Amino acid sequence: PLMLDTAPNAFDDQYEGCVNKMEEKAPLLLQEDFNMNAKLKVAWEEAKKRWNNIKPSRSYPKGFNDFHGTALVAYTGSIAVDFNRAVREFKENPGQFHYKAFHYYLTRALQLLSNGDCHSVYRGTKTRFHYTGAGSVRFGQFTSSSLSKKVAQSQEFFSDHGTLFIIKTCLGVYIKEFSFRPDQEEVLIPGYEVYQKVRTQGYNEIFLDSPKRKKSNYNCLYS
Numbered sequence: 625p626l627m628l629d630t631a632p633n634a635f636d637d638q639y640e641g642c643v644n645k646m647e648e649k650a651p652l653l654l655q656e657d658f659n660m661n662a663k664l665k666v667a668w669e670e671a672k673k674r675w676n677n678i679k680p681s682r683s684y685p686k687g688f689n690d691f692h693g694t695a696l697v698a699y700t701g702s703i704a705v706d707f708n709r710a711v712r713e714f715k716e717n718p719g720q721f722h723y724k725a726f727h728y729y730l731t732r733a734l735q736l737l738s739n740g741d742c743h744s745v746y747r748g749t750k751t752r753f754h755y756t757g758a759g760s761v762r763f764g765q766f767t768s769s770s771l772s773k774k775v776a777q778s779q780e781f782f783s784d785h786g787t788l789f790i791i792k793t794c795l796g797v798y799i800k801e802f803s804f805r806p807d808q809e810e811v812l813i814p815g816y817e818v819y820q821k822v823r824t825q826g827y828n829e830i831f832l833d834s835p836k837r838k839k840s841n842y843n844c845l846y847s
């Protein structure tokens with residue numbers, strides 16, 4: 625069982641005040657991330673091809689480019705596990721975060737696609753989570769959820785040994801049209817969204833509500 629807390633160790637950069645500076649530096653950093661992360665490089669190359677195929681479909685916000693589209697696609701792929709891990713364990717080993725540009729492009733993609741809408745989403749896990757007992761909570765790492773309770777409860781993500789999160793998010797973004805799995809009806813939640821209302825329901829259900837944006841512990845770290 626894992627604890628549901630404020631994720632004090634997670635890299636949670638919101639890039640406040642350095643968007644343009646990161647835009648300029650991220651291309652070089654992306655290349656550095658690849659040199660330090662061969663798997664990431666493979667995952668990005670795969671995502672780039674998928675993105676080249678899907679983008680002609682619709683339009684995107686002002687400023688949204690191939691880096692943002694490819695990062696989102698790539699997140700719905702195999703690189704997710706390691707990336708979420710690195711983000712989660714950031715404070716414990718800062719010199720091993722080989723996702724400097726990746727994290728930026730993914731964060732910015734979510735920021736660009738976000739409007740003020742809130743969604744009712746669900747997230748299932750194989751690992752049981754326990755609320756610490758006090759204070760608001762945060763996931764820290766980017767967090768996948770679904771509009772479909774059936775998807776979140778599916779054998780793919782959930783089990784009686786884990787937890788089903790029932791969530792009301794207002795920073796989450798519907799990214800179905802980017803995913804390698806459109807069927808999952810995914811809503812991607814930034815790790816910096818805080819839930820001021822936490823209620824445990826039964827042994828495997830946790831209700832998260834009263835979502836709020838909250839200043840991060842890290843800001844423009846690699847700018």
Ligand SMILES: NC(=O)c1cncc(Br)c1
Pocket residue numbers: 746747748749768769770775776777781808809810811
């Ligand atoms: N853990 C989950 O419920 C989940 C994880 N990834 C995508 C989607 Br949709 C859901």
